[PDB]
């Protein structure tokens, strides 16, 4: 949005990036950032379901990443000009070091799950995958 | 400490030191405390004479360049910030700077006061005196230093 | 010790006339216990600055007055933990410690484990510990059967 001041009479906000639509997400790991990113917009995405919204049908939990090697992050909402949340989701993912995809929830049949985990090419993480 | 004892002694003797007079860059060769005759001394020379009485010598005339590289001081608060609430944490004997270009300095004493010479520029006849920090707080500049003798040389 | 640190409580616990109708002990230190115990006693080991997992068997033993009521059996438990702790270390790191453990050393730990398990049964304060040690009594027997076989493989 280009032409919105959002001022107030003789009052103002101490944090910068206020009045304007700027939003900042901060976390020391991908699961901390991705939680804030998804949780920021998911509830308000409303639909005409007789029973809820996407948050009941998508768990988007049990996320992890390289917390020890990744410092604190200041990822900006508008890093991509009028892009989709998927475009902004890719930046948070930091591929190929972390693997993001949508797949059925075997642990909870009947509903889908958003997966965000460190790549399984590590030796112990490779053994952690279920064999078939 | 040395600096606190010297500041307390100066405070106690402040009313008897009316012989000392203010000037811009008074660097007399006579010690003010060892002479009943009046003498024009500035704040830097005053501190030099006050510290010279004991075993410490420092250097002469002890201009602003002294604090930069001699390693006799360590800064407590930097220049360019000015908080009124953190004045209470100060201690007696801390040097207080004044002016935008380090024109004058002072010695802090408790109860929110400081010891310095203030007067018109062209060699004022006003003697040394103690003033409240409230009116001079505008021109404080936030720079504060402290002394250390044990480790030096 | 070479790879990762260990909890402070376990380091502190490890450095230090009843009869059963089925069992008798002998207080042999296993050869691997003999050399690992010296390292624990020395300061050359990393250690952690905080403790968690309060459900472990170590805190259970600490909470009960077994130290003052039966210091003999408290000693045997330390011996059980000393052998049991060492045989966990070699598989996960430092394989060079192998060919220093024999099935006889591992066998007598069950003797000592059941010789204390009967004693623990006489005072049902220690039930939480009893429950734990019985789970390990079948664990060691598997290692005894595989230890001569594993040693030749490695």
């Amino acid at each position: 949005i280009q032409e919105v001041q959002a001022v107030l009479p003789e009052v103002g906000w101490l944090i910068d990036g206020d009045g304007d639509n700027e939003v900042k997400f901060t976390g020391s790991s991908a699961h901390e950032v991705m939680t804030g990113i998804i949780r920021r917009f998911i509830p308000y995405m409303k639909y005409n379901y007789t029973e809820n919204t996407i948050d009941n049908y998508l768990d988007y939990d049990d996320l992890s990443s390289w917390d020890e090697f990744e410092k604190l992050t200041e990822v900006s909402a508008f890093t991509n000009f009028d892009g989709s949340l998927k475009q902004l989701m890719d930046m948070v993912t930091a591929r190929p070091f972390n693997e993001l995809f949508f797949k059925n929830s075997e642990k909870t049949p009947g509903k889908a799950q958003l997966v965000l985990r460190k790549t399984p090419f590590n030796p112990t993480e490779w053994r952690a995958l279920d064999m078939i | 400490p040395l600096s606190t004892i010297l500041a307390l002694d100066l405070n106690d003797n402040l009313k008897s030191l009316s012989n000392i007079k203010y000037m811009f860059k008074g660097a007399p060769k006579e010690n003010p405390f060892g002479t009943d005759k009046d003498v024009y001394i500035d704040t830097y020379n005053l501190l030099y004479w006050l510290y010279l009485g004991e075993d410490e010598e420092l250097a002469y005339p002890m201009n602003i360049n002294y604090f930069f590289t001699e390693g006799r001081f360590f800064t407590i608060f930097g220049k360019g910030h000015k908080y009124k609430v953190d004045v209470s944490k100060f201690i007696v004997g801390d040097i207080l700077f004044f002016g935008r270009s380090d024109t004058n300095i002072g010695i802090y004493v408790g109860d929110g006061e400081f010891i310095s010479m203030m007067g018109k520029f062209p060699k004022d006849e006003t003697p040394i005196g103690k003033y409240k920090l409230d009116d001079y707080w505008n021109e404080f500049n936030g720079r504060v230093m402290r002394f250390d003798e044990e480790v030096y040389i | 010790n070479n790879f990762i640190p260990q909890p402070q409580g376990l380091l502190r616990f490890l450095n230090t006339s009843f009869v059963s109708k089925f069992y008798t002990p002998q207080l042999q230190l296993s050869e691997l216990a003999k050399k690992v115990l010296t390292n624990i006693k020395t300061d050359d080991i990393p250690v952690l600055e905080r403790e968690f997992n309060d459900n472990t068997i170590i805190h259970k033993a600490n909470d009960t007055l077994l130290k003052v009521q039966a210091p003999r059996m408290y000693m045997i438990l330390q011996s059980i933990v000393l052998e049991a702790y060492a045989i966990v270390n070699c598989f996960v790191e430092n394989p060079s410690s192998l060919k220093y453990l024999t099935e006889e050393d591992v066998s007598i730990t069950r003797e000592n484990l059941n010789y204390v398990a009967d004693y623990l049964g006489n005072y049902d304060d220690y039930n939480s510990v009893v429950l734990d040690l019985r789970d390990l009594d079948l664990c060691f027997s598997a290692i005894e059967l595989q230890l001569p076989l594993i040693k030749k493989e490695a």
Partner: protein, 348 residues
Amino acid sequence: MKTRKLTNILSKLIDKTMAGTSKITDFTPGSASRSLLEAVSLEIEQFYILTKENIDWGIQEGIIEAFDFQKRQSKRAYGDVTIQFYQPLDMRMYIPAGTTFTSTRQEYPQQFETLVDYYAEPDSTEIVVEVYCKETGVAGNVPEGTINTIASGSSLIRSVNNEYSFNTGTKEESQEDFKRRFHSFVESRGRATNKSVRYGALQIPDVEGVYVYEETGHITVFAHDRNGNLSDTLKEDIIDALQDYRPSGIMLDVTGVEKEEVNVSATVTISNKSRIGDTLQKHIESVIRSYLNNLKTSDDLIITDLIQAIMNIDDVLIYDVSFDNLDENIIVPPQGIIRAGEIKVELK
């Protein structure tokens, strides 16, 4: 319903088994019948133990259900932070509730957030605001000077720091704590009693220390959190919730807290003459600090309790402890609370 250890079961079993025949009496470890009967007795022993544990858990659960005195869940960590401006302020600027605070240190990545707004007064220079930790447990108890940044634009803010440590971050209450709380609850059913006002004022989850001083015609309540600082919101909540236990004909006041200071000097003779460096002394000072800071108003400094606390370390290491200054028990006044000042520990 009683324990029966494995060998007792196994013996009863074999004793019964041998009745009516004598073609079985060979029970060496190699025998398979012995192994089967050992396994059956192992399972029966485990059954008895789990039964007894489940009985205890049922007792606890019924105690929960009957009086509706549910166990306290995980308790959030919170405290105070200082915002520092580049210059004194030029307008009545404002912080909204739910502003984030993050520590730049990699060893404490936990975040914090505010719950109530604040306005900064014009021409002010600092402000103290309360921050609540999203995570709950031990991770909220960060050390001093941990929260460095606000994790936002911070245009008019230079740096943020905390002068005190977080102590309210605690894990879930154990069985023993719940039993103590419940025994005070059972003894607090009669109102107009000091033991009743104890529970009366302890019912708020955040309160940890609490003491009540009485006189001829007035009642006073002294309470604080683990940090040891009373808040006006807590006082209001206490007044609101405590109406059902307040004495009818006697006034009540909830206020009054002071930090009593004492310097502890001890001498420790380690059994190992080697390894007597200041690193272990740092650990011992940190343990003493954690012990002294944990006390409350109702507790008082005792020499023997301190000796027990510090001697939790294995007696093989520390062989002797003595105090050079402390020779008598110190009695804390009701309003004040004893805590660690500046501690000095040395070998000899």
